[PDB]
């Protein structure tokens, strides 16, 4: 196949993407080994769905797992009556998700399970895929002439030819695996044919962070989770927390081999030690560095100029309410809280008004990083840790290190009941989720 493995793409046809996908245990070859994973569409990752604004999506999910499951259309500002976090598809049963892609939308999104208490094992086992919304902006020469690739960043651990089971420590920290893969491949080689690359990045890991850096090169950030920036932003590195997406341009500077790495990063994961009267928690410290892929530049690279502009960010109405959402931890219990409570699907935590804007202050009072996700209503990050964000773009996950406060501008869009939760999915399963009702 092509030197660089990427998931199969399924494209809408005549404005309709109609597809039947089964969630199924699937024997496959993974990183040189045979394993049985849980997959959509018989592959890991699942197929990439590629659509345009105003397309109709009609996706019938058949559940061939021994437990119930469902789908979250992560990042899509659609109705929570479609992206329904409370729906359960029993084993053997099917459900059809039908929605129209919003007109003002572009970027890299994804789909994965969201059945409370079962997300972490299902996601860890291989149930996820990407969804790309193509934009008229993709036609500008500076993007059209770039070489485009999707990178799905997901790690895995195998035991007896199956995904390794969750330990108690896994429920506390979120599970990370030793196989650090890109598109399900182990350190693939990307042999660039053009001097400018456009890379869509997705962190579909349960808990692993990717502190991304390309040897000898900066990255040019052009989109965040849910849409384009207003103009490219040069960065030396880019941290992608679980659930986050980004799009970057890479401008290859000279011939040669360059490593794309996940640099050491300490997300506050914890171990246990006994030093002669202990039996107490101790920091794991930073992750060991990982090579994600080998990037070979072409002969005499002459990259395109950067686009001068991307998409102007909408001017939002003045906000009508300010919310405060405090995250805390009980590590030894592996319990996680928002404003002192664990999730209860029958309990509404916030009630807001559609078409108004809110300010959400989300404060991490724990010691671990927590990546905060809100369904249905993309937001603009104003600041985190008291530092103003250096760009305007739509996001739907924001990472908070210990002690940090994020201030978000949240326009409420579709009416209905939805959720917000930590996207270290173990923490969500263990209670770190709440309910927002929009009317």
Residues 303-362 that bind a second copy (CB under 8 A): 320-322
Q: Confirm if 422 and 430 have CB atoms less than 8 A apart.
A: no
Based on CB atoms, which residue is closest to ligand [O-], 126 or 232? Answer: 126
Based on CB atoms, which residue is closest to a second copy, 3 or 353? Answer: 353
Q: Does 116 carry a binding-site annotation?
A: no
Shortest spacing between CB 92 and ligand [O-], in angstroms = 24
Number of residues that bind a second copy (CB under 8 A): 3
Among 424, 435, 436, 438, binds Cu ion (CB under 5 A): 424
Strand partners, 295: 190, 258
Q: Which two tokens stand for residue 6?
A: 């990427």
CA–CA gap between residue 326 and residue 338 (Å, rounded): 5
CA–CA gap between residue 119 and residue 434 (Å, rounded): 15
| Residue whose C-alpha is closest to residue 202's, from 74, 108, 71, 76 | 108
Number of residues that bind ligand [O-] (CB under 6 A): 4
Sign (positive or negative) of CA dihedral 342, 437, 100, 197: negative
Q: Does 370 carry a binding-site annotation?
A: yes
Q: Confirm if 307 and 143 have CB atoms less than 8 A apart.
A: yes
Among 51, 120, 406, 422, binds Cu ion (CB under 5 A): 422
Shortest spacing between CB 317 and a second copy, in angstroms = 11
Based on CB atoms, which residue is closest to a second copy, 282 or 320? Answer: 320
175 sits near ligand [O-] (criterion: CB under 6 A) = no
Q: What, of ligand [O-], Cu ion, a second copy, none, does residue 320 touch, CB below 5 to 8 Å by kind?
A: a second copy
Q: How far is CA 153 from CA 6, 204, 243, 291, 436, in A?
A: 11, 6, 10, 12, 30
Q: How far is CA 279 from CA 213, 275, 282, 285, in A?
A: 37, 7, 10, 18
Kindly provide the b/e burial profile for residues 199-223, where b requires at least 16 CB atoms within 10 angstroms of the residue's own CB.
bbbbbbbbbbbbbbbbeebbbbbbb
Q: Does 72 carry a binding-site annotation?
A: yes
Q: Confirm if 153 and 199 have CB atoms less than 8 A apart.
A: no
395 sits near ligand [O-] (criterion: CB under 6 A) = no
Based on CB atoms, which residue is closest to Cu ion, 106 or 424? Answer: 424
Q: What, of ligand [O-], a second copy, Cu ion, none, does residue 427 touch, CB below 5 to 8 Å by kind?
A: Cu ion
Sign (positive or negative) of CA dihedral 115, 45, 55, 380: positive
430 sits near ligand [O-] (criterion: CB under 6 A) = no
Q: Does 166 carry a binding-site annotation?
A: no
417 sits near ligand [O-] (criterion: CB under 6 A) = no
Shortest spacing between CB 125 and ligand [O-], in angstroms = 16
Shortest spacing between CB 436 and a second copy, in angstroms = 16
Binding residues for Cu(2+): 72, 74, 112, 114, 280, 370, 373, 375, 421-423, 427
Q: Which residues bind a second copy (CB under 8 A)?
A: 320-322
Q: Contact positions toward ligand [O-], by CB under 6 A?
A: 72, 74, 114, 373
């Amino acid at each position: 196949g092509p030197s660089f493995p990427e998931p199969k793409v399924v494209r809408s046809q005549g404005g309709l993407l109609s597809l039947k996908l089964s969630a199924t245990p699937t024997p496959l070859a993974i990183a040189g080994q045979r394993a049985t994973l849980l997959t959509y569409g018989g592959s890991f990752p699942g197929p990439t769905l590629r659509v345009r604004p105003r397309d109709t999506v009609r996706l019938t999910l058949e559940n061939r797992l021994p437990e119930p499951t469902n789908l979250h259309w992560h990042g899509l500002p659609i109705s929570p009556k479609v992206d329904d976090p409370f729906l359960e598809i029993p084993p053997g049963e099917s459900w059809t998700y039908e929605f129209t892609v919003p007109k003002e939308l572009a970027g890299t999104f994804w789909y994965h399970p969201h059945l409370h208490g079962r997300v972490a094992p299902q996601l860890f086992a291989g149930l996820l895929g990407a969804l790309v919304v193509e934009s008229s902006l993709d036609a500008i020469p500076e993007l059209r002439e770039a070489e485009e690739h999707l990178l799905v960043l997901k790690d895995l651990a195998l035991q007896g030819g199956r995904p390794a089971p969750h330990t108690p420590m896994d429920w506390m920290n979120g599970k990370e695996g030793d196989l650090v893969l890109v598109n399900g491949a182990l350190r693939p080689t990307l042999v660039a044919q053009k001097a400018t690359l456009r890379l869509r990045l997705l962190n579909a890991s349960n808990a692993r962070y990717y502190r991304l850096a390309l040897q000898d090169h900066p990255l040019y950030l052009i989109a965040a989770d849910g849409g384009f920036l207003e103009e490219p932003l040069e960065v030396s590195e880019l941290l992608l927390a679980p659930g986050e997406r980004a799009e970057v341009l890479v401008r290859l500077r000279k011939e040669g081999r360059f490593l794309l790495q996940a640099l050491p990063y300490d997300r506050g994961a914890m171990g246990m030690m006994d030093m002669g009267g202990m039996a107490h928690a101790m920091p794991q410290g930073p992750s060991r560095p990982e090579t994600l892929l080998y990037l070979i530049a072409p002969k005499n690279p002459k990259p395109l100029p950067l686009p001068k502009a991307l998409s102007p960010f909408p001017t939002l109405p003045a906000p009508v309410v300010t919310r405060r959402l405090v995250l805390t931890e009980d590590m030894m219990a592996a319990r996680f809280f928002i404003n002192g409570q664990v999730f209860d699907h029958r309990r509404v935590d916030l009630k807001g008004q559609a078409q108004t804007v809110e300010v959400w202050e989300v404060e991490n009072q724990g010691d671990m990083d927590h990546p905060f996700h809100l369904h249905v209503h993309p937001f603009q990050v104003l600041s985190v840790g008291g530092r103003p964000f250096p760009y305007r773009a739509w996001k739907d996950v924001v990472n908070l290190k210990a002690g940090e406060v994020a201030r978000l501008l949240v326009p409420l869009r579709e009416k209905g009941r939805t959720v917000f939760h930590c996207h270290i999915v173990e923490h969500e399963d263990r209670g770190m989720m709440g309910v927002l009702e929009v009317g």
